[PDB]
Each structure stands twice: as C-alpha cells, then as structure tokens.
Design a protein around this ligand. Structure first.
Ligand SMILES: O=C(N/N=C/c1cc(O)c(O)c(O)c1)c1cc(O)c(O)c(O)c1
Ligand SMILES: [Mn+2]
Ligand SMILES: [Mn+2]
Length: 177
C-alpha cells in the first residue's frame, strides 16, 4: 500500500499527506490505509478546484493552518459570509459559499449525515463522493457540471480498481469508521 500511494499520487499530495499524519503522531508507513485516504481526499479537492472556470474556487485544504485561516477570515471580511467553526475545503466565488468535500469508502448518505452533524452549520455546502460512482450534495446542488463530476467519479473508480488489483481494496474499504 505504501508503494501504491507513492506510485499513484503525485509527490506534492504524498508530502502533504505524510505531514498531516505526522502532525497526529501517526506513521504513514504503518497506518497505510489512512495514508491512502488522505491522499485521495487531497486529489479530489484539487480536481474539484480545477472543475470550474479559472478563479472559480479558492483552495483551503492542503494549506498550513495559519494560511488556511488567513484565507478563510479574508473571505469572510471580503464577502460578509459567516465564519465557519472548522476549516472547509474550498470557497466558491461564483456561489459565494464554502464547500466541504467528503470521500467515503462506505455509503454517501451516512457520510453526508456525519459531515452535516460535525460541520453543524447552515452556511457550508457539503459534497460527498464514493469510489463506486455515487455522489450526494446539499440541496441536490452539485456545483460543477456533469463532465467535471464524471472525471472525479472516474478517477475514484480507477483508484478502487488499482487497489483491488493488488488485493488492497478490502482492507481499505473496511478501515473507515
Ligand atoms: O476528519 C478528517 N481528518 N482526520 C481527523 C483525525 C483525527 C484524529 O484524532 C486522528 O487520530 C486521525 O488519524 C485523524 C477530515 C476529513 C475531511 O474531509 C476534511 O476535509 C478534513 O479537513 C479533515
Ligand atoms: Mn478539509
Ligand atoms: Mn473534506
């Protein structure tokens, strides 16, 4: 699985994921499923940010915490939007709202609900993807066009297929709590 992550995700994603894990005192070489999940989430966030017009999205995920909150507080002051309690993943300049992105190995509806409980904010939009082509977004509002969304769902299915081929998928699918 460590070989898999290092060959399927670009080095910038891998580096961010290793750092996030070490910040919690986890070793990427041991908790390899968490490692893979962090990388996949990061890639989806970056893919989503590329899905719109140039300048449609500001990326918040993948930033150190000081810069992430600088970006968030800046947007709240520039736009007057409510300040979230937790860092979201992106801000949408077209829709004027923060987005929380979820990627789940279980079922989208359960993950949407968990996310909606934790976020517990009216303001933040939630968009969940599975590795088997399912998605679920706030007010059935999917933000991006179908072509962009299909390219994300396809990348996730491809990662699922690659893990499967290495007999990694079963352990990975079962590691999400
Ligand atoms: O919950 C998330 N990450 N991990 C939290 C976490 C908390 C712990 O106490 C651990 O021991 C751990 O391994 C991970 C998580 C999930 C997302 O979709 C995000 O966008 C995000 O910023 C964080
Ligand atoms: Mn995030
Ligand atoms: Mn997220």
């Amino acid at each position: 699985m460590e070989d898999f992550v290092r060959q399927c995700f670009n080095p910038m994603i891998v580096e961010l994921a290793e750092k996030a894990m070490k910040e919690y005192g986890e070793d990427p070489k041991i908790e390899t499923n968490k490692f893979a999940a962090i990388c996949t989430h990061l890639e989806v966030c970056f893919m989503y940010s590329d899905g719109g017009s140039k300048h449609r999205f500001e990326i918040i995920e993948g930033r150190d915490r000081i810069m992430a909150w600088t970006v968030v507080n800046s947007i709240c002051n520039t736009t007057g939007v409510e300040k979230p309690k937790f860092l979201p993943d992106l801000y949408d300049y077209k829709e004027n709202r923060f987005i929380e992105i979820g990627v789940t190995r279980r079922e989208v509806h359960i993950y949407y609900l968990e996310k909606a409980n934790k976020i517990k904010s009216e303001k933040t939009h939630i968009h969940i993807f599975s590795f088997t082509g399912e998605e679920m977004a706030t007010k059935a509002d999917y933000t991006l066009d179908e072509e962009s969304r299909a390219r994300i769902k396809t990348r996730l299915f491809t990662i699922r297929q690659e893990m499967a081929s290495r007999s990694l998928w079963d352990s990975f699918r079962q590691s999400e709590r």
